[PDB]
Design a protein around this ligand. Sequence first.
Ligand SMILES: Nc1ncnc2c1ncn2[C@@H]1O[C@@H]2COP(=O)(O)O[C@H]2[C@H]1O
Ligand SMILES: Nc1ncnc2c1ncn2[C@@H]1O[C@@H]2COP(=O)(O)O[C@H]2[C@H]1O
Ligand SMILES: Nc1ncnc2c1ncn2[C@@H]1O[C@@H]2COP(=O)(O)O[C@H]2[C@H]1O
Lengths: 201, 207
Amino acid sequence: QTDPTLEWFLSHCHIHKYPSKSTLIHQGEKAETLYYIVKGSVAVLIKDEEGKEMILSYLNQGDFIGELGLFEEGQERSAWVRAKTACEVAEISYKKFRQLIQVNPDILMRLSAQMARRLQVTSEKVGNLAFLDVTGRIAQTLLNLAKQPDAMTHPDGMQIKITRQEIGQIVGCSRETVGRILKMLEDQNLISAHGKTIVVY
Amino acid sequence: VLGKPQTDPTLEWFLSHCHIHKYPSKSTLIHQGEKAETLYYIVKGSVAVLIKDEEGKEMILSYLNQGDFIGELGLFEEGQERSAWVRAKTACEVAEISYKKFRQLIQVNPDILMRLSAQMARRLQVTSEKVGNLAFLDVTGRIAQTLLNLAKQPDAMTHPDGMQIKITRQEIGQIVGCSRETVGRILKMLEDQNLISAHGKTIVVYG
Ligand SMILES: Nc1ncnc2c1ncn2[C@@H]1O[C@@H]2COP(=O)(O)O[C@H]2[C@H]1O
Ligand SMILES: Nc1ncnc2c1ncn2[C@@H]1O[C@@H]2COP(=O)(O)O[C@H]2[C@H]1O
Ligand SMILES: Nc1ncnc2c1ncn2[C@@H]1O[C@@H]2COP(=O)(O)O[C@H]2[C@H]1O
């Protein structure tokens, strides 16, 4: 939930609300502010020259955002961050945050812990993209999804609400191809798809 | 008069609490899967951080050099395992310290944590870029883009037909995550398409 250290930090921040689908951070912007999700979830994405989008990660309540430019001035935001649901996010200037670190470094410890987890997760993603064919990547994804907090249940494993587009942004493939692969998987008796709902055996 | 610190005082302080050892090229410093309880710091040399598929095909997540911390990912939560193998690329001199001791140092001077965090931030930026490239390019494009980027490094040699780089098929394979044989077939194709010239471990990237 929360504690006095986190609340001490938050009392130094201004809270802003972001409707679902609104962009909090744009790639290329000058990085001078740190964010903290008090409520809601977001998606972190990068793009290709022709507009193809790839989702690097989903982040939720309790997660810091916009932290990558904190340790060196003059850096640009490394990706776009968009609200997945309605969000309430705390924000504070890098300058003010660095001053807080000196008062109580524990706040930096908490931020660093999340960066470490993100590097582990992103590195696993590199491996999947390099060693698994699109079919195996989709297979693996239909699992990592049952890990998210928004994940639900079902007698035969668990149910999730994911679209072809969302899957494609995660594995690096068109909606069309994702559709063909999903059909093969349920043909291989691995899953059961019903609209935007899927059953993971 | 007593002299000034040969190098950064905070770094020397940190290193005085570590134990340092020498590792010959090709030696494995960190094995993927081991329980993580210690932090490393490269005093001299360079290493390769790598992962492998079920059959042993290798991919380098990153090269790390003098001044870089290693084995830091298990520091913020106990019970974790090493996320990848770390193998010496050249002869290395590496410092090691327990997470327990490092945490005590952090309490004394938070600056040492700031320094480590700065590196984790940079690694996340670089690794995220790699994810994009792997998602947006097929095997041919990954190799073509890797050659182009190598041609843009300061160590790349100017050539009358473009830029000249020196790298083996094995190293290229390790960067893109494919076999030496695959690199061979694709380099031959790129050459037939008059995009590059290959002669041994010397490649000319046409401009
Ligand atoms: N290699 C890729 N090929 C096709 N689409 C990709 C790739 N990498 C990422 N994508 C994105 O994945 C998205 C999912 O569905 P769309 O076809 O609507 O649009 C897609 C692209 O923007
Ligand atoms: N691989 C990743 N995993 C999780 N979050 C990321 C990743 N890459 C970028 N981000 C977030 O995207 C944010 C947008 O701008 P910053 O680079 O300032 O800080 C970034 C990180 O918080
Ligand atoms: N993507 C990456 N970029 C740079 N270094 C990495 C990456 N992934 C893992 N490492 C290093 O590999 C080390 C081996 O074990 P740890 O997980 O303890 O700490 C790790 C990091 O120091």
